[PDB]
Ligand binder design. Structure first.
Ligand code: PRO
Ligand code: PRO
Ligand code: PRO
Ligand code: K
Ligand code: K
Ligand code: K
Ligand code: MN
Ligand code: MN
Ligand code: MN
Ligand code: NA
Ligand code: NA
Ligand code: NA
Ligand code: NA
Lengths: 512, 521, 508
């Protein structure tokens, strides 16, 4: 029994490949898929974040749909306090990125406690701001003022993560009938599929939240409800000069987002399949189509793509996930997502560490299960119009890593660019990317297979010696992490001279 | 639009059919010619002044056919080759190494001399009786009634109704009666018989020695004359290779043994021959007589296939531009034969009569050169590369990894060349194996390694005459710039183009473990 | 134990493993799918010779109208039919034979020994057309001086001699030289020649072909779509069922091939003149591209010229000629052609037999699984029902190692679709249309069988009768025997405009 699903790897067809998947074929130790965790009251303590980091967390997400600047700043500080609790040991230190997830053009309800909305029983949507806090089973207020100009006779309104549904019967108010009932809570989200919502891509709140992200030196923004390239560019404008290096990950979570997908991709730095609202804005049975289309097209462009939301939902209450949840994580990884995400499971659930641990474990099994040879061939075909020198290095290196079954790839990188181009070509072996730039190290977490290492050492006067310094750091990192041992082979990627604008030098080195 | 060079639009096809359908006559080929060109030297090409023009036309390997000629003759030819080759040595940047190969007589069956009385040749007529004798009194008195041949033990291997073939299988006899010391035959295929013509017995187990006393002396003489390779005739099994090896011995251990496949038995036992050999020749002339002629292409394609799979050199040989012995231009089939052989994957292609005795030896050499570049571009590299990888994928060898990584990287940035620093040749050899479309400029201080490199598709050997620089860094750099200068002068690339450079990181390495993309300065 | 028909290689995953598995000890099947077209001249024109020509494998008789009179070719055509019809007593083993008129077209030619670097006077004066000399040569091109430049080259006699234009009458310097003779072909590569595409000498020959009941025209030096439409206009209403095979033999033919292919009913790679018009080292490029594009559109393609050239004087071919034939079949050519080999050679019978033997070796050595998959993909925009039925039948033939496909057809179009998808098993095509059966020899695999019985009362009875005739033909010619499996394509009801019914039927 070969490890790392290598028998399946040798197969000629996809059918064969699958018939060959073996439960007794141990994954390797390295974990290539990044894990993004929404932080909240279950996970907001220094103490729990230490454990979250140890469990697998690479990126911490701040959900700006709730909480004040004060509250979010403290959390950020808590994440950093915990991340830095490991700073003294360069061999084990894990950078941890901070992510800002914006509110965007949300429609939420008001205050009431709880109220029940029965199947068939009429309900009245109003915008009269006197009822902001006087909602019940007769009267329902939401904060979207122009709701009336955008919906038709026979339109549907979904309330509370799509659980409750309503049909608009007559016309600054709407009178609806309950189609799908439930219990109605305070400040629950509202969706209007088929309606072309005209709230700003970026509201005042958003603008203040984005500016705040700048001040807080966040590494990336998760931009909610992006519909078009112009939305992305608005977000880019607010971040401005001081924040030019923060990556904009666009959230695809409505029909228009999907329609205009190519342009959003081009304009953005990465993408998030935000399946929550997506499954409400379009039929839920269609979501997998979008997941797969998006991940595919992001792989093709070499830009990070994140599969999110409800991936291990039941784990909010139970210590073990469901069979559907297991399969969902694996398939997201087989689809080619760079990152997978936890929301409620870590923000508020009863088993936050467990959820992180489960993602870590499923990631490795599915990583080994990919059909690397065909995937490599297909990505090469897709990028074949480009003759880029760094792509050439990356492909040669990856192909080199497949042939000799290298234990890792070692990339020296300042901008991160060399590392990213290696990642996009999907080697099985982890990419240990050594960098003197802390932000690059943090942002590298967006890319499948990059294990970032911060090098704190001063630069040596001799280039070769400074280079050897950084490779040996990765050698030491790779060994403490159980990636390799003395006598294994790794691919190494460096600049020949200090002026080399990319890793133009590849080597097969034995691990010392 | 822009029409891409080197059939690069056809290179991007997803199917073999679309690749065919994208082939473009207006897609100009590159200047590098990757297919090694082997020329049989003879009266047509022996002079020093003609050999120089053979080199300028593209000859990489001069072949000495030991079925004819004394040692005094071949030593003069080999001298002439080296005189011609060294006339160019004054320009290290332009000088082209030239390999010397010894093609052995082997277990050949030949007829005698036609008698003086009568016509120059005889007419063997369909339905007429011809007797075959071993009586040495007729060895120079052959005619229509009585034919002498040199296989003394012929009577022990043929039967009544056996077929004896004569003169490149143009003339066939059927054995009608068997005598102890003679055969009575009937002519099935008529024709005009000259002297010392080739005889084949396809349905017979010929007991002649794989390596005869003549071959032995011929081999030893090969060793004393510092030939780079041996083309061993009529190799039937592995033990035939081991015998040639034994004879070449310790002194000739770096001499490459190319096994010539030309009988059914050599095709049946090909694998054990390949393992034992340094390379193979599809020696089609005899093969097309021993097995049915309509079956030769199957064997040719199987062999070229299996040597590609194994990383061993293969040569397509025989009658490729045959008509150019008397005509300035080839036929349309001949043009196709050269191209399809290159497409098959042949590392080298060869010329026999076309350079040995022909009227147009320079024009023959030039034509192979021009076809080879057309077909080299017309190959389906992306699919060739994928399929060679799959067949070798049980190997995790480090040099193959470097080789695969370098070729892949050359496909992606469309490198103008791969530079390879090598002493034994192994590093270059393994790159060649994986079939980049760019040329492989191999730099070596080992002169023999340079000459042997012609056996491998794409390797453009370059002799480094400079002393070993003290710092390993400067010694590597020196050998890169040489390849840079060679490349530029030869028109393979210019400033601003990109090459893939393969080097050793430290002196100790036993293979190129360093790959770079580097701009030409 | 070795599987027949290269079936071990048929099972390879990659192109390389397919090559590596090719087995000389793997026996080919009896049937031969690549059509043999044979140029008929003084060596082959007699009835007795022609009978053996048909016996050895000739399917198409080609008359070359570059030479000879209407009276001469009429005698040749007359002898072809006599030979052919001498077999008509046995409708089982009778082999239909097709007659092709190959047009002179826009030739240039000399009148009635040249040293390298010697000056030669080219003139158009009709006072020299019978006394051509060392220093004065006459040709029949009038516009020549308007289409050639200083420095441009002119080639004489199958491109053997080269002469560079030095001054405008034309004075030239010989480059390559040899023995010069009577009425020798002239080529002007890369100079746009403006001779009529279909001359008066052509329009007379084409009309002759209609009257002479020929099945296909091979239209020489086809440059563009217009040119095919001209040959099509000339053939007129009476000659509408005659197929037009356009001959690709100059740079523009290749340049504009696509519009030509759409306009033509088939294509010949006319290699001789092509290897004179473009660098000869490029010919294989144009050959493979062309065959591929024809394969794709499912229009017949003939590979032609010099395939067995040395057999003009020798009983056995060179290895380069062997190789050429097999690679032509592996390329995908529907038909292969002999010229000088059968027209004037010393061994026209042996040349036919070697094309036959070479064909069957190479036909088995095709990589059918990959070829089918690649044809389907390229034709995937088409949803045509006959194509659907064809593809399903070929697929079914592959899966059960079926001994043959039996196709019933009047237009031939159903059989043409089957052939196009390249089964390894032969296609027995039964037709009451004598001209359909003759034109079928243009398509890979199609073994046309003439039905001479009248249309039966019951539609089902008429189908069984035709299918049983196809079984009888197959069994007599050793394609299959009792218990073998065949794919059988028929129409369900009389009015079906194609074979909509497919069966796996046992051979009785
Ligand atoms: O460094 C890590 O742990 C993760 C692995 C994939 C992206 N970054
Ligand atoms: O260097 C040369 O000229 C030839 C080309 C490939 C093999 N050697
Ligand atoms: O019937 C025959 O013999 C040939 C086979 C291919 C075309 N016609
Ligand atoms: K949000
Ligand atoms: K020999
Ligand atoms: K003609
Ligand atoms: Mn959302
Ligand atoms: Mn031989
Ligand atoms: Mn022609
Ligand atoms: Na970089
Ligand atoms: Na004599
Ligand atoms: Na070496
Ligand atoms: Na039909």
């Amino acid at each position: 029994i070969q490890t790392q699903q290598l028998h399946a790897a040798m197969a000629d067809t996809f059918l064969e490949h699958k018939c060959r998947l073996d439960i007794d074929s141990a994954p390797i130790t390295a974990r290539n898929t990044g894990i993004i965790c929404t932080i909240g009251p279950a996970s907001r303590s220094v103490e729990t974040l230490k454990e979250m980091i140890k469990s697998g967390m690479n990126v911490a997400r701040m959900n700006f749909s709730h909480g004040t600047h004060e509250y979010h700043a403290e959390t950020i500080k808590n994440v950093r306090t915990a991340t830095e609790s490991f700073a003294s040991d360069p061999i084990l230190y894990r950078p941890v990125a901070v992510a800002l997830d914006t509110k965007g053009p949300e429609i939420r309800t008001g205050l009431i406690a709880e109220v029940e909305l029965k199947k068939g029983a009429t309900l009245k949507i109003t915008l009269d701001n006197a009822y902001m806090e006087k909602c019940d089973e007769n009267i329902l207020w939401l904060d979207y003022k122009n709701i009336c100009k955008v919906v038709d006779v026979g339109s549907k309104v979904y309330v509370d993560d799509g659980l409750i549904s309503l049909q608009v019967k007559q016309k600054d108010f709407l009178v609806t009938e309950v189609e799908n009932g439930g219990f109605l809570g305070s400040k629950k989200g509202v969706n209007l599929p088929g309606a072309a919502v005209d709230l700003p891509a970026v509201s005042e709140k958003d603008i203040q939240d984005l500016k705040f992200g700048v001040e807080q030196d966040v590494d990336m923004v998760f931009a909610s409800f992006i519909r078009k390239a112009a939305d992305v560019h608005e977000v880019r404008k607010i971040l401005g000069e001081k924040g030019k290096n923060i990556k904009i990950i666009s959230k695809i979570e409505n029909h228009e987002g999907v329609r205009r997908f190519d342009e959003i991709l081009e304009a953005s730095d990465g993408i998030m399949v935000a399946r929550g609202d997506l499954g409400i804005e379009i039929p839920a049975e269609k979501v997998f189509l979008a997941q797969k289309m998006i991940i595919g097209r992001c792989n093709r462009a070499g830009k990070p793509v994140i599969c999110a939301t409800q991936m291990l939902e039941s784990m909010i209450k139970k210590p073990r996930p469901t069979r559907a949840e297991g399969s969902d994580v694996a398939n997201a990884v087989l689809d080619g997502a760079d990152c997978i995400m936890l929301s409620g499971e870590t923000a508020k659930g009863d088993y936050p560490l467990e959820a992180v641990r489960m993602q870590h474990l499923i990631a490795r099994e599915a990583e080994a299960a990919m059909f690397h040879r065909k995937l490599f061939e297909e990505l090469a075909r897709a990028s074949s119009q480009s003759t880029d020198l760094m792509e050439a290095m990356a492909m040669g290196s990856v192909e080199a890593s497949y042939k000799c079954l290298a234990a890792a790839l070692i990339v020296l990188t300042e901008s991160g660019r060399s590392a990213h181009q290696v990642a996009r070509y999907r080697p099985r072996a982890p990419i240990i990317a050594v960098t003197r730039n802390h932000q690059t190290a943090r942002q590298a977490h967006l890319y499948r297979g990059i294990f970032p290492v911060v090098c704190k050492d001063p630069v040596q006067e001799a280039w070769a010696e400074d280079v050897d310094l950084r490779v040996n750091l990765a050698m030491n990192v790779g060994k403490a992490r159980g990636f390799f041992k003395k006598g294994d082979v790794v691919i190494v990627l460096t600049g020949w001279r200090p002026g080399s604008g990319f890793t133009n030098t590849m080597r097969v080195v034995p691990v010392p």
